[PDB]
């Protein structure tokens, strides 16, 4: 079983930690949603291939530009995260996360993942965004950003309801297997 490495990058409260914890636990944490994610090795069978997928997180490293690159060695797939309820986090994708990921990880597939897709039809999320003269990130805006930054693909999911989570990690495994 081939070993492959996955790293999730993105702004602070974009939900990258929640996503890893939901995938590794299989369910949304019932009694306690943890604060941090250490690491996890997942046994995935994508399209008839058995892979060991090491899952890493960059949460906590966002302000430390000399520490953070130490997460990048030997990465096979980058999950580039952004939050659908935060259009500002999407603006930082081509300005900050794409130049850095492409510098330390040349030729490493990136899947642009749009987290928190459930909040797209939430009442409180739309009212607060309207005060700031905005609205949730539309699917076409995510696809237009994944296209502009040369991402391998664009995928959406919800850590809360678990919809689309299994498919993001399965696709990441397929992307990491390409050479």
């Amino acid at each position: 079983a081939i070993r492959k490495k996955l790293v999730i990058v993105g702004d602070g409260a974009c939900g990258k930690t929640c996503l890893l914890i939901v995938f590794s636990k299989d369910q949304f944490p019932e009694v306690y949603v943890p604060t941090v994610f250490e690491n996890y090795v997942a046994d995935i069978e994508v399209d008839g291939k058995q892979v060991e997928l090491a899952l890493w997180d960059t949460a906590g490293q966002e302000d430390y530009d000399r520490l953070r690159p130490l997460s990048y060695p030997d990465t096979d797939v980058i999950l580039m995260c952004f939050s659908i309820d935060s259009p500002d986090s999407l603006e930082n994708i081509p300005e900050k996360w794409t130049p850095e990921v492409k510098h330390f990880c040349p030729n490493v597939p990136i899947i642009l993942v749009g987290n928190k897709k459930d909040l797209r039809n939430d009442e409180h999320t739309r009212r607060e965004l309207a005060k700031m003269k905005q609205e949730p990130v539309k699917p076409e805006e995510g696809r237009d950003m994944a296209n502009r930054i040369g991402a391998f693909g664009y995928m959406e999911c919800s850590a809360k309801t678990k919809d689309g989570v299994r498919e993001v990690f399965e696709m990441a495994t397929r992307a990491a297997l390409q050479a």
Binding site: T35, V41, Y64, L67, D74
Partner: protein, 235 residues
């Protein structure tokens, strides 16, 4: 790890670690504050267990079972004894603070009212300087350690045999040489996340909100200094 602490931190949270009737005696904010504290100690326990895997299982294994130069083993596992002494004393202090808070007649029901002082002493003074100097060195030697391990695995067949043996148990699934090295580097950036979420549920005792705020600034000053002192080495 020791079975006593493995069992004490086996539960997924503080709410499931304490007795159900003991949990029913407290306010919701108390349950939330203790869940985050329990996690700080749980991850500290796992952090020290990681550092012991690097020192006794990998490092000591390569010294007794292999004909490698002692300078090669030091390159694969830099500052691991110092990191082991630093965090073992911290885990010690966190575990004693939990035992002092234990209910008489019980070994699992506890509520920690004071944590801030413990963190202020760890993240300040000569203890913080020792830790800052140690992590700046560790993180500057992290790349050279990954590259050195990869060269040894791609040239030496006896080193390949050693790695297949030590990491064969299921226990070591996410804990190989390289995983351990990254586990140790990402650890310091976990503390401000934990201390901020603890501070968020510590607005009962005012001296405690000020202690967690002082420790939060201490961890960030420390992290900023570890980050400023990083200077990646090459083979």
């Amino acid at each position: 790890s020791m079975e006593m602490d493995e069992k004490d931190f086996a539960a997924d949270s503080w709410s499931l670690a304490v007795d159900s009737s003991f949990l029913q005696q407290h306010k919701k904010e108390v349950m939330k504050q203790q869940d985050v504290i329990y996690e700080l100690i749980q991850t500290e326990l796992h952090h020290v267990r990681t550092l012991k895997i690097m020192t006794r299982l990998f490092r000591t294994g390569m010294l007794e079972e292999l004909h490698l130069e002692p300078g090669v083993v030091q390159g694969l596992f830099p500052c691991v004894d110092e990191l082991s002494d630093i965090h073992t004393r911290f885990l010690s202090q966190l575990l004693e603070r939990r035992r002092q808070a234990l209910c008489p007649g019980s070994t699992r029901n506890f509520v920690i009212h004071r944590l801030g002082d413990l963190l202020i002493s760890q993240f300040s003074g000569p203890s913080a300087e020792q830790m800052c100097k140690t992590y700046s060195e560790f993180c500057s030697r992290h790349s050279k350690a990954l590259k050195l391990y990869k060269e040894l695995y791609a040239r030496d067949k006896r080193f390949q045999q050693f790695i297949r043996k030590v990491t064969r148990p299921a226990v070591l699934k996410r804990h190989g040489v390289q995983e351990c090295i990254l586990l140790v580097t990402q650890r310091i950036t976990k503390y401000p996340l934990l201390i901020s979420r603890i501070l968020q549920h510590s607005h009962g005792i005012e001296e405690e909100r000020q202690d967690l705020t002082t420790a939060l600034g201490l961890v960030k000053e420390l992290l900023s200094n570890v980050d400023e002192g990083i200077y990646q080495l090459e083979k």
